[PDB]
Amino acid sequence: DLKFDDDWKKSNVAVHLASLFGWVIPSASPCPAFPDNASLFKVFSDRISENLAHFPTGPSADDPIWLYMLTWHMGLFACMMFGQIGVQARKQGYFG
Amino acid sequence: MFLISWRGYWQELIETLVWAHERTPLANFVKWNDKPVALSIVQARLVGLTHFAVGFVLTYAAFVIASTSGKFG
Amino acid sequence: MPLSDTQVFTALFVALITGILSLRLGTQLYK
Amino acid sequence: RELWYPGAVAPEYLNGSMAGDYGFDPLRLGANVETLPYLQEAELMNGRWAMAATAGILFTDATGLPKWWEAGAADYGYDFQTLVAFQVVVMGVLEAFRVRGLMKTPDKRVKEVKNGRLAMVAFLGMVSSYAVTGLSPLEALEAHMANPQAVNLFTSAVGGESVAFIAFLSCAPTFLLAQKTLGDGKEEFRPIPW
């Protein structure tokens, strides 16, 4: 009807896990562009560890954590948004 | 601003603002006693003329006093 | 020679009376 | 009944019911009905404290004890912090009790009222005389009685101020008489609107 649906989110645990881990695993795969074939997740976690030793002191403006954070979170959120879109569209009649 | 832009753009803008305030949570608790409307045509012509004249006089007063006092005290 | 404090306060009290009279005139005008 | 000057007009909310009611409220502070009992009780309290203060100042001055303005600096058994803590606690408790009693709720009443009124005037006089001349109340009285003609408020440092204020007081009721006989006395505004 024309009443608002309180289940607008349609939050699916399987979507959450699929998107999170299906971005983490590819981002944890070897990447020959990074040194020692390190992954984006690997270098990002390395920067997190290095900056968490100095917990109150934030990362320096020149520290590579920012670029890794952006280039990892974009892909993560892309996986989350597109996974929700694809799952809810397949559940509905958008595809078949 | 008051001289060039005229009432009817501002009236519609205020109408959208009325809608926004009426539909904002925690702000609809407070309601205007007088319906907010744009400045009338004559009123705004006057307001713009007053601003024009005030800025005119104050700018020139500042200039004529500051330059003359800086060069002569 | 600066003005004495008694001079300033006397003039200020005269001003307060003048202000009272101005309020009386304003109320009378508003009628 | 006699009002605050011969020819005055008492405000309609001042009909002589309250003790000491002389129809004096030019600024209409007690015009609001609900705050008028509060203002009565504020008068009674300020009067009572001024009465106690006048007694404790005059007796202290006449018994050779330290001057009332100097009495704080005297060496007492208890320091400032503990004394103010004592004061805060006990006066808070007593004023809580007074507030709750007030929330619950002739000759002698009028007497008390007048006495408090005189006290508040007398205390203001003592503070002003000290601030202007630096003389305690009994010393100020002795100085006045020694040379009554030239030693007075109106010949002190604030003399012209006092002369102007007394002129204003003396010329106020004449202007009020003109206002009554010429105007209609139909003011829609009050000097303190609330």
Add this chain to the structure above:
Amino acid sequence: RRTKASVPAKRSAFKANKFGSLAPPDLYPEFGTYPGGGESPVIPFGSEKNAEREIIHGRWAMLGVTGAWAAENGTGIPWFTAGTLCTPDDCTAVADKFPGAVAPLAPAGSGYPNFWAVLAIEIFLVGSAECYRTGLFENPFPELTQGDVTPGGRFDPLGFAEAGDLEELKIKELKHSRLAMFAWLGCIMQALATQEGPIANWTAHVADPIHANVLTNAAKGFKFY
């Protein structure tokens, strides 16, 4: 906002299954009797309220006895001197008093339990609960009755009361209560007489049982004669 008012249908994280009574049919073969089941052997029954007073002192003295026991076992500090640790001054020490504590109440440095801070929290928490238990304040849980020492609603999340026999559990608690109160009295008298903690007195009494008794310390006058 619309009214949902759906069915929660939640179950307890733990809900003890019916286990009934684990005691004999006789319930107080010990000296005296539980209130409401016979005549007081010695002291007169002061008032109906006294039963509930006994329960509250009992539960509090249980908690106090276990606290003195665990504090002396974990730190060696006697309970009667543990108060001197947290004071308006130097309450930092009281922090690291729990064996195995992953972290201190007082992180290294200034970071610390202040006496007044602790105290202010203590008043605001314990007094609130104390009042809510009794007729003071109001009843935040209408389903429970203020002035009842055995509410048994939200206060038994595991549901042992309903899982077993309620009244045998009640008398079991009462016996534990009286035992712990008498033990607490023994602890205070031992503290007064020997100036050493309860577990210290225990250890002295078990290392050489024949000595290190009341009468052994009395031979020295309890350090006062």
Add this chain to the structure above:
Amino acid sequence: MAASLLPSIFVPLVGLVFPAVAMASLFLYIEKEQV
């Protein structure tokens, strides 16, 4: 003494206190219903 005292009192009186009371009062009157 006037010079050291009166400016520091009357500038806030005329530029913060009197404006506040005047605006509040005028507001209360203007929004006051006719009846």
Add this chain to the structure above:
Amino acid sequence: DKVQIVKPINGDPFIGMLETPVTSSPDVANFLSNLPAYRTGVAPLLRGVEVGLAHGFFVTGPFIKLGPLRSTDAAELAGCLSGAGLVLILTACLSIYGATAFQREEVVGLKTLSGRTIAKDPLQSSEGWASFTSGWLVGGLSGVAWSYVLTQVLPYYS
């Protein structure tokens, strides 16, 4: 099957509003409904208390950290006195709003989105707004004082 999320207000498509995940989401609705302003059955004074406490607590901080005396050791005391002054001004604003706003009858009632007829908020009245203003004043001054206390007390404050 081809679910549409955005719907008209309460299903009426002729009112100036639309129900969206920002307006009618369950989490948003529960948060707003639990705020003191929307507790219409509670006394206006106590709602004003919490309001004042929250508002006076935070509003002090800008004056502490960005006021004229932020560099001086008296930065906190200045900021808290600024916050108290702002609380007094807002109390004046509340008093005048309460005097002027509630002068009309408002004959039309109010209902919930479920259609349950409910009484008007006692806050939305002259005396109710006066009680709310008093609660605001007490709460704001208590919150300003608490902010002062916490700036003088809190361990990791700087």
Add this chain to the structure above:
Amino acid sequence: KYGDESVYFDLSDVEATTGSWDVYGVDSASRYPEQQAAFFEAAAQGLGRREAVYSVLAVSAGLLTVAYGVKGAKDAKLPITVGPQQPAQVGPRDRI
């Protein structure tokens, strides 16, 4: 009836017709602890009246302005209260 199909006008249900809906309001009678409520009732005992608040704010205005002009400004070490404490300068044409 307002609840009928495609009907949004009802002279009996004027509130639903005109849209006067309580969106987030809740009519629960109690949310705070009662004694906390009593304390804050007593803390604002005399201030529940609007004219009492008017007197409070007028007195507060007077006391704050007096204290600021007497003691508050100097205590805050305002530059205006501090004297110039510097040698003076002469304008052009030797005009002091």
